[PDB]
Design a protein around this ligand. Structure first.
Ligand SMILES: *[C@@H]1O[C@H](CO)[C@@H](O[C@@H]2O[C@H](CO)[C@@H](O)[C@H](O)[C@H]2NC(C)=O)[C@H](O)[C@H]1NC(C)=O
Ligand SMILES: *[C@@H]1O[C@H](CO)[C@@H](O[C@@H]2O[C@H](CO)[C@@H](O)[C@H](O)[C@H]2NC(C)=O)[C@H](O)[C@H]1NC(C)=O
Ligand SMILES: *[C@@H]1O[C@H](CO)[C@@H](O[C@@H]2O[C@H](CO)[C@@H](O)[C@H](O)[C@H]2NC(C)=O)[C@H](O)[C@H]1NC(C)=O
Ligand SMILES: *[C@@H]1O[C@H](CO)[C@@H](O[C@@H]2O[C@H](CO)[C@@H](O)[C@H](O)[C@H]2NC(C)=O)[C@H](O)[C@H]1NC(C)=O
Ligand SMILES: *[C@@H]1O[C@H](CO)[C@@H](O[C@@H]2O[C@H](CO)[C@@H](O)[C@H](O)[C@H]2NC(C)=O)[C@H](O)[C@H]1NC(C)=O
Ligand SMILES: *[C@@H]1O[C@H](CO)[C@@H](O)[C@H](O)[C@H]1NC(C)=O
Ligand SMILES: *[C@@H]1O[C@H](CO)[C@@H](O)[C@H](O)[C@H]1NC(C)=O
Ligand SMILES: *[C@@H]1O[C@H](CO)[C@@H](O)[C@H](O)[C@H]1NC(C)=O
Ligand SMILES: *[C@@H]1O[C@H](CO)[C@@H](O)[C@H](O)[C@H]1NC(C)=O
Ligand SMILES: *[C@@H]1O[C@H](CO)[C@@H](O)[C@H](O)[C@H]1NC(C)=O
Ligand SMILES: *[C@@H]1O[C@H](CO)[C@@H](O)[C@H](O)[C@H]1NC(C)=O
Ligand SMILES: *[C@@H]1O[C@H](CO)[C@@H](O)[C@H](O)[C@H]1NC(C)=O
Ligand SMILES: *[C@@H]1O[C@H](CO)[C@@H](O)[C@H](O)[C@H]1NC(C)=O
Ligand SMILES: *[C@@H]1O[C@H](CO)[C@@H](O)[C@H](O)[C@H]1NC(C)=O
Lengths: 172, 586, 766
């Protein structure tokens, strides 16, 4: 029924991967909605939503890694981000409460659209791999800063993987 | 109850094999002393013969049908008791048995930020329900399915968000109560089936410096950052309905502005735009709202027409000469006319200039030779000067035109003439309607000296005599005017001429008649006729030319009353006039 | 020289005096009281403890014992001169609540010291701000009963205890009505402070509190580094410098909290600390609480919460419904319904129990609400929508219905309403009652309806209690039986031009008469000896020919249906001749034309009047109408009657099995005066005679039968000469004079009026 690899043209597969990465690297689409919906829409609190060291792999490591190890690391990272995003979705309030308080549901829409983007990226990574054939309790205010740091690290990793994808053009 | 026909409610395919078995119980068997040998089969139309059903055992009977071509068949098994008595037991029915066939024409379309919708065709009629379901899944992930609704069995909207740049394989599987069958398997990228949203908020901006450019501005959809899109701009004027399309080679890139060229004169235009993917894969968006826009105006200049007229009432020492000019056409004026400037220059004397906001100006003129110019002013300046020399009081107009001809062509009179030997500059055509009660309404038109055949640009009336007057315009003065009469469309006269007897003799009578007025002729009278008859004799006819107004009658008898009548004929026809009666003396 | 006595137990007076001037250390004193029994003692200090004496003045003599002389002085002490100074109290235990920031004090009153009852007034003083401050001062009154009683005192604080150290002091002041002396206040107890160990695990206090919108709340922030400011969302707050680097802020009338809560943060040099506060509202009373059932098995009850509680997530308001007679309770899960069905809960019924007294209770971390109502489960049943509605035929004038109703209604009855919707008519409704059963299909048959008619059936049913009406079921369209013949069609016979064939005409029976689709017509022209020519003609052919040799044959046209035959309509074929025929004229009054004829006693069966178009050479579209013999004046109603068209009416008489013609009448639907006068012109004129000729007026503009012409002439003494001859179109006038202008006027007149006139002026010849 279902085919092994979703596509057989390496060129269009690489193009799809690059376009998906350039689309998912949108800070204003992913991180800013979170800070806006979390009530931290002030410059003083925004100055602290930064990436912590040791959260995501580095650009030097991503450049030094090969192809199959790169794909496996990206797969594991996507799984971890999917788990954390499911946790955050469990944490965020409901759309009716957002509208009552005065916030916007565009942030929730962007998150619920970005999660299937991660799913599709994982599926495309699997297609490429087949085609190549070769804390007891935390504070309510601390959780928001943790979300800031995690999302900033995720955006940094997305920028790194986008630069990586743009580095290598074609491969036999 | 004592029997039952198995199966209870069968639905077999039309024109197929079927077998019905009516099994009875021992109660009626040992009550009526019967068995399966007495079981008979009778349908709703006829009785099944004996050689058509086979007895299974002592309490069972089976019948077969080799061809089912009816929509409803009431099969009832009956028993034969003592005394040739028949008793009903049970009955069944078979309704609407036919299998369906697999579908085709699998096509899916994706909207902007919405779910993917796929369609197909139903196929041949099966007289039965068929639940169509399509399977959509990735290389490693399986999605949900759609159930064919009863309103439209060829449409489905998925429940998951469209993930772009992911080749998905989708196929429709036809499933019914008689088997399953799947259609072809196709794979496609959902970004290739995206139907973009039509652009909104289209505005047209003109320019102040140039008069042939328009700055178009519109809003691009939100998918402008994902894929590169092209545009198609169709523009047209307000009077013409044909839409001129801009070549797509100039709008093959992502842009929100464009300038149209080659629209000079004061014209409002309507614009509309659509958009789709750059490589041409997908569907074109809807057409944008029709937006209006007026360009900047250009101010060229054209040559006007000028002519002068002199009245017969001459003052002692001065003459009253009136100047008349025609309004420039919109294609020649190319703007709003402001005022007219006419200059009067004598032979080496003072210059006189006058500004007139109308199409007529009369001035007191002397007996010397003058030269009048006509310069119309517009928003940018003035046009060329219409040179026309006004002759003196003692100047004799000579060198007239030759070969004066006038005949209607295409419901329009065309006056042609031979140009004189001299170098003619312009030509003027004066024409008026002839009437014994109303004067001439002098309408004129000016044309170049190179054409020797023109038509009267005006609202001409039929059945009217027009006195066309042509005058050649030279460098010193106008030529000798020539007059000619013509008709737009000839018609029979409204009334006939009245006759009268001048002298009646013993065998001769002299008649007399007046010429018909030009208002009742309605054409060129060619010849006349006189109908003189007798109360007892027959009516005769006689021909007479139009140049003669009298006629004589010969071979007349005495002591007899004669009745005469006269008609005026034209190229279209003629009408008889009043009858006259006179007697012959002895 | 100064004696001041104090007492702390109302039983032993501790009198103290000053030493005289010149008395050194180690001085012996002999002091006593002049009483009923002189008992003097010897002491070494200037402080004697004497028992409580009676009411009165007592003499006290002091004796300073020295080796160089003795001193003797007297003193007068009374009960009004002794001061009451009780002993100082002592704090036994001091505990403080850490979660609620509440203090607890325990102290003993030592009631065994005083034998009589006395009112004791305690004054507790709460301190803080270790440098210096005073906050609380509350009075406490107790009662002594000769026994030591341990009292308790509690007080809640507003500022978190983790930001300041507190102090506690308390004194007492007894009231003795039997003591006439001076009562003084007791000394303050030793200071007993409470200290908290600064572990400093967090910074801001409190953490995730649930307070009401509109109350006062004070925050604090313990820190060892310098702070900058405090922010509540986007609004600033003034800082209150506490001990050390600790700061505090005050919030009055706090606004409504958001989804994530009004985070109160304290900005610092390099970091930031803050917590979340949740401001909510008490739970509203559940409104519109009405419980009902659908199948007498479950109780589904809904209610409207009204005003929102402003608290969601792990602190949402939970609802709890408990039974009164059975004590059974149910609790709603976390999954809540959308706004359209905001709240609904199912409750299982209890067998052999019909009266229900429900009490719904809601509770949030801020408060609680309740609501009571008494409901009768047998009067609040919702009839379920009937399904599987089928239509079955029985016979010609009846049809059967059937529908299914799930539920155990075996004890109640149903009142089902059957709606009869006949096409192109008025909507009909029928009500029928049936005994309810347990999960079975009900079958009700109706009758007394017109056959051959399509109907649309839909039924809705309600209980006898008449509480709620069930929804309308799906409409079902069904056709009735074949037909039912009632009467026979109207027939009429005519003879052909050859005198041999007899053509027969008949009208189709209407729907209200045929009550079904006609299949064929059974025609038969039979005599009194033998039935012949039995043929059947189908629709839509309404004419048939049958060759007959004699005129005594009777015609029996019978319409055929699917069930039987229509009643036969007999008509005679013999045509009795009548030579005494006369043409008559009739005038149509409006749409119909009246017919008047004399009653003939010899007529047997009825009267027949036929008519067609006489202005066409094509065969007529003959129509007839049977009129009984008892009628003498009738009118003809037909849509084919048009103005200006003449119709020939023939009246036949039914005399001795034969149709004999009586009257032949012609006329129009409308007859009035002519609209235009006949145009006339002069041909010849003499000196004593004239000649005129008018053109015949067509029947289209005459609008009736022209009776003649009225010609008028006179000088212009006028003369009127009527010409009743309709064929005479020529008129001449004699006895005329010359050179006289006459006015000739011609005017036409009819039975329905006089038309206009035309005039002209001519001069006679000479
Ligand atoms: C990518 O990570 C997943 C873990 O989530 C690995 O396991 C696969 O998980 C998917 C989940 O739908 C299953 O469909 C696969 O069958 C799992 N694979 C195996 C081998 O069990 C997955 O293997 C990883 N991919 C690669 C290429 O390493
Ligand atoms: C059902 O029973 C009928 C009657 O016995 C049979 O139909 C035969 O079908 C075959 C195959 O199409 C034909 O060649 C024969 O002519 C049919 N008639 C007979 C009498 O054999 C058969 O037994 C059953 N039909 C099917 C399609 O199985
Ligand atoms: C506050 O209370 C503490 C005890 O809770 C007091 O500390 C005591 O001080 C006395 C006298 O200096 C010592 O004898 C005790 O051993 C101390 N208790 C301890 C160390 O637990 C303290 O003096 C009180 N006052 C202040 C201002 O801190
Ligand atoms: C219905 O049940 C309640 C028990 O929950 C009975 O008790 C009443 O409870 C309400 C609580 O809102 C109190 O306000 C009443 O004072 C209680 N009444 C008594 C008599 O205890 C209640 O009585 C029952 N209803 C009836 C009509 O008896
Ligand atoms: C609750 O409803 C039941 C059913 O409607 C009531 O029982 C009825 O009582 C009346 C007395 O007036 C009888 O005539 C009916 O026959 C009863 N119906 C039955 C037995 O089905 C009952 O009275 C109601 N109770 C209250 C408190 O309203
Ligand atoms: C006869 O055949 C019928 C078929 O249904 C069934 O009753 C049974 O198999 C047989 N019964 C007897 C009594 O032989
Ligand atoms: C599929 O449907 C389309 C309708 O848009 C039309 O081309 C035709 O009906 C079908 N074409 C093919 C190739 O089946
Ligand atoms: C463009 O103009 C329209 C109508 O004038 C109006 O909706 C708005 O100003 C613009 N459109 C949008 C989507 O903002
Ligand atoms: C008079 O001139 C003005 C220009 O200022 C303009 O209205 C037009 O040319 C003239 N008016 C009329 C009524 O013709
Ligand atoms: C024409 O005469 C007018 C006098 O009113 C003068 O203002 C104008 O300048 C003259 N034009 C030229 C071209 O000399
Ligand atoms: C100007 O013309 C008018 C019109 O005829 C007339 O008064 C005369 O001819 C002239 N008058 C003067 C003063 O030039
Ligand atoms: C309610 O709060 C506002 C500030 O939000 C304050 O100005 C007002 O005085 C308060 N009202 C009362 C009654 O305390
Ligand atoms: C048809 O059946 C109904 C039963 O409801 C009965 O009343 C009626 O008489 C029957 N009519 C005939 C013609 O049998
Ligand atoms: C209706 O429910 C009852 C259970 O009380 C059952 O006995 C009966 O068979 C059911 N009837 C139908 C038609 O399902």
């Amino acid at each position: 029924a279902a085919i092994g690899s979703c596509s057989k043209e390496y060129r269009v597969l690489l193009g799809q991967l690059q376009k998906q990465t350039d689309l998912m690297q949108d800070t204003s689409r992913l991180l800013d909605p979170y800070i806006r919906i979390q009530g931290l829409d002030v410059p003083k609190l925004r100055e602290h939503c930064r990436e912590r060291p040791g959260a995501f792999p580095s650009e030097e490591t991503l450049r030094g890694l090969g192809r199959r190890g790169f794909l496996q690391t990206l797969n594991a990272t996507l799984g971890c981000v999917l788990h954390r995003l499911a946790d955050l979705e469990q944490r965020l309030p409901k759309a009716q409460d957002l509208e009552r308080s005065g916030l916007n549901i565009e942030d929730l829409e962007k998150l619920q659209m970005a999660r299937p983007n991660i799913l599709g990226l994982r599926n495309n990574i699997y297609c490429m791999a087949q085609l190549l054939d070769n804390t007891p309790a935390s504070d309510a205010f601390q959780r928001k800063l943790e979300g800031c740091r995690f999302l900033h690290g995720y955006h940094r990793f997305m920028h790194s993987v986008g630069r990586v994808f743009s580095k290598w053009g074609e491969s036999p | 109850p004592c029997g039952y026909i198995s199966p209870e409610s069968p639905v077999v395919q039309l024109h197929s094999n079927f077998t019905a078995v009516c099994v009875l119980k021992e109660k009626c068997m040992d009550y009526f002393h019967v068995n399966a040998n007495y079981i008979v089969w009778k349908t709703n139309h006829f009785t099944i013969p004996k050689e058509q059903y086979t007895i299974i055992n002592r309490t069972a009977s089976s019948v077969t049908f080799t061809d089912i071509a009816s929509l409803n068949i009431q099969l009832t098994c009956n028993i034969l008791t003592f005394g040739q008595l028949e008793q009903n037991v049970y009955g069944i029915t078979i309704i609407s048995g036919l299998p369906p066939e697999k579908p085709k024409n699998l096509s899916c379309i994706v909207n902007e930020g919405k779910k993917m919708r796929c369609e197909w065709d139903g196929g041949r009629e099966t007289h039965l329900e068929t639940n169509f379901t399509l399977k959509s899944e990735w290389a490693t992930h399986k999605f949900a399915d759609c159930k064919a609704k009863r309103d439209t069995p060829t449409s489905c909207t998925v429940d998951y968000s469209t993930v772009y740049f992911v080749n998905i394989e989708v196929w429709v599987e036809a499933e019914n109560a008689l088997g399953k069958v799947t259609s072809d398997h196709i794979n496609f990228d959902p970004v290739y089936k995206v139907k973009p949203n039509p652009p909104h908020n289209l505005s047209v901006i003109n320019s102040e410096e140039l008069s042939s450019i328009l700055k178009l501005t519109w809003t691009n959809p939100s998918i402008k950052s994902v894929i590169i899109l092209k545009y198609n701009i169709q523009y047209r004027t307000k009077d013409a309905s044909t839409w001129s399309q801009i070549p797509p080679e100039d709008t093959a890139s992502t842009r929100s502005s464009f300038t149209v060229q080659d629209l000079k004169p004061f014209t409002e235009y309507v614009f509309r735009i659509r958009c789709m993917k750059e490589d041409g894969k997908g569907y074109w968006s809807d057409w944008s709202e029709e937006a209006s826009g007026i360009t900047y105006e250009d101010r060229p200049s054209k040559a006007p027409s000028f002519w002068y007229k002199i009245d017969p009432s001459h003052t002692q020492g001065y003459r009253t000469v009136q100047l008349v000019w025609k309004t420039l056409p919109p294609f020649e004026a190319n703007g709003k006319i402001l005022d007219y400037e006419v200059t009067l220059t004598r032979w080496k004397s003072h210059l006189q200039n006058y500004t007139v906001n109308a199409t007529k100006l009369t001035v007191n003129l002397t007996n010397d030779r003058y030269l009048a110019t006509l310069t119309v002013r517009n928003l940018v300046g003035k046009s060329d000067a219409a040179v026309l020399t006004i002759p003196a009081c003692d100047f004799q107009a000579t060198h007239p035109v030759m070969d004066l001809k006038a005949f209607p062509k295409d419901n329009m009179l065309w006056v042609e003439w031979t140009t004189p030997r001299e170098s003619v500059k312009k030509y003027i055509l004066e024409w008026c309607v002839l009437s014994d009660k109303a004067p001439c309404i002098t309408d004129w038109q000016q044309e170049d000296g190179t054409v020797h055949r023109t038509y009267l640009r005006g609202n001409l009336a039929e059945s009217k005599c027009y006195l066309i007057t042509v005058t050649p315009v030279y460098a010193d003065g106008p030529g000798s005017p020539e007059s000619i009469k013509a008709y737009l469309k000839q018609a029979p006269p409204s009334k006939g001429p009245t006759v009268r007897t001048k002298k009646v003799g013993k065998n001769e009578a002299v008649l007399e008649w007046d010429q018909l007025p030009v208002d009742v002729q309605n054409g060129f009278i060619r010849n006349y006729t006189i109908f003189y008859r007798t109360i007892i004799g027959n009516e005769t006819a006689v021909n007479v030319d139009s140049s003669h107004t009298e006629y004589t009658l010969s071979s007349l008898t005495s002591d007899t009353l004669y009745m005469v009548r006269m008609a005026a004929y034209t190229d279209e026809g003629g009408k008889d006039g009043p009858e006259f009666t006179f007697t012959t003396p002895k | 020289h100064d004696l001041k006595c104090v007492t702390n137990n109302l039983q032993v007076w501790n009198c103290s005096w000053k030493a005289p001037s010149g008395t050194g250390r180690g001085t012996d004193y002999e002091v006593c009281i002049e009483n009923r029994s002189r008992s003097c003692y010897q002491l070494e200090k200037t402080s004697i403890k004497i028992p409580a004496l009676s009411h009165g003045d007592y003499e006290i003599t002091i004796n300073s014992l020295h080796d160089f002389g003795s001193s003797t002085s007297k003193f007068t002490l009374n009960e009004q001169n002794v001061s009451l100074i009780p002993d100082t109290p002592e704090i036994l235990n001091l505990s403080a609540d850490f979660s609620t920031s509440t203090l607890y004090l325990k102290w003993n009153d030592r009631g065994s010291v005083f034998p009589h009852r006395s009112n004791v007034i305690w004054e507790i003083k709460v301190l803080r701000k270790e440098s210096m401050e005073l906050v609380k001062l509350v009075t406490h009154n107790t009662t002594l009963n000769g026994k030591d009683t341990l009292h308790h005192w509690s007080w809640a604080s507003d500022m978190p205890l983790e930001c300041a150290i507190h102090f506690v002091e308390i004194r007492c002041y007894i009231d003795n009505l039997h003591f006439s002396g001076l009562e003084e206040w007791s000394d303050w107890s030793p200071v007993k402070n409470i200290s908290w160990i600064p572990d400093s695990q967090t910074k801001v206090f409190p953490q995730d509190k649930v307070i009401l919108v509109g109350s006062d709340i004070t925050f604090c922030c313990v820190s060892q580094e310098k702070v900058l400011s405090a922010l509540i969302g986007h609004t600033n707050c003034p800082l209150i410098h506490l001990d050390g680097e600790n700061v505090a802020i005050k919030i009055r009338n706090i606004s409504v909290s958001a989804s994530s809560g009004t985070n109160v943060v304290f900005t610092t040099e390099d970091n930031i600390f803050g917590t979340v506060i949740f401001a909510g509202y008490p739970p509203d009373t559940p409104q519109q609480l009405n419980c009902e059932t659908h199948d007498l098995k479950e109780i589904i009850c809904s209610w409207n919460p009204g005003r929102v509680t402003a608290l969601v997530g792990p602190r949402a308001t939970s609802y709890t419904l408990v039974e009164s007679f059975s004590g059974k309770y149910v609790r709603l899960k976390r999954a809540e319904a959308p706004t359209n069905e905001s709240y609904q809960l199912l409750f299982q019924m209890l067998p052999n129990q019909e009266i229900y007294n429900f009490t719904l209770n809601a509770h949030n971390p801020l408060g609680r609400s309740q609501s009571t109502i008494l409901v009768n489960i047998t009067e609040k049943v919702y009839p379920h929508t009937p399904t599987s509605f089928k239509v079955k035929d029985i016979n010609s004038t009846a049809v059967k219905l059937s529908w299914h109703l799930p539920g155990n209604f075996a004890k109640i009855n149903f009142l089902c309403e059957i709606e009869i919707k006949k096409s192109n008519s008025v909507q009909e409704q029928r009500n029928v009652t049936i005994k309810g059963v347990e999960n079975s299909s009900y079958l009700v048959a109706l009758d007394k309806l017109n056959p051959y008619t399509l109907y649309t059936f839909r039924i809705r049913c309600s209980t006898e209690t008449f509480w709620k009406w069930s929804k309308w079921s799906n409409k079902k369209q069904h056709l009735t039986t074949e037909a039912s013949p009632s009467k026979g069609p109207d027939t009429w016979r005519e003879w052909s031009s050859d005198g041999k064939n007899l053509i027969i005409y008949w009208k189709p029976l209407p729907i209200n008469e045929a009550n079904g689709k006609i299949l064929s017509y059974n025609v038969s022209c039979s005599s009194d000896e033998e039935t012949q020519s039995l043929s059947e003609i189908p629709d839509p052919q309404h004419k048939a020919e049958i060759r007959l040799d004699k005129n005594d044959y009777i015609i029996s046209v019978v319409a055929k249906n699917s069930v039987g035959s229509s009643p036969p309509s007999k008509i005679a074929s013999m045509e009795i001749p009548n030579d005494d025929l006369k043409i008559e004229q009739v005038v149509g009054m409006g749409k119909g034309i009246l017919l008047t004829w004399h009653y003939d006693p010899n007529m047997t069966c009825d009267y027949v009047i036929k008519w067609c178009n006489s202005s066409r050479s094509e065969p007529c579209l003959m129509d007839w109408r049977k009129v009984p013999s008892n009628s003498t004046e009738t009118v003809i109603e037909s849509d084919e009657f048009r103005p200006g068209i003449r119709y020939n009416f023939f009246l036949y008489g039914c005399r001795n099995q034969g149709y004999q013609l009586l009257r032949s009448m012609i006329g129009y639907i409308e007859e009035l005066a002519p609209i235009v006068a006949p145009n006339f012109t002069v041909e010849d004129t003499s000196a004593d005679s004239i000649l005129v000729k008018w053109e015949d007026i067509p029947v289209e503009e005459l609008r009736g039968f022209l009776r003649g012409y009225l010609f008028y002439f006179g000088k212009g003494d006028i003369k009127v000469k009527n010409i009743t001859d309709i064929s005479q179109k020529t008129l001449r006038i004699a006895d005329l004079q010359g050179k006289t202008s006459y006015h000739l006027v011609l005017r036409a007149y009819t039975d329905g009026g006089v038309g206009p006139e035309k005039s002209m002026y001519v001069v006679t010849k000479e």
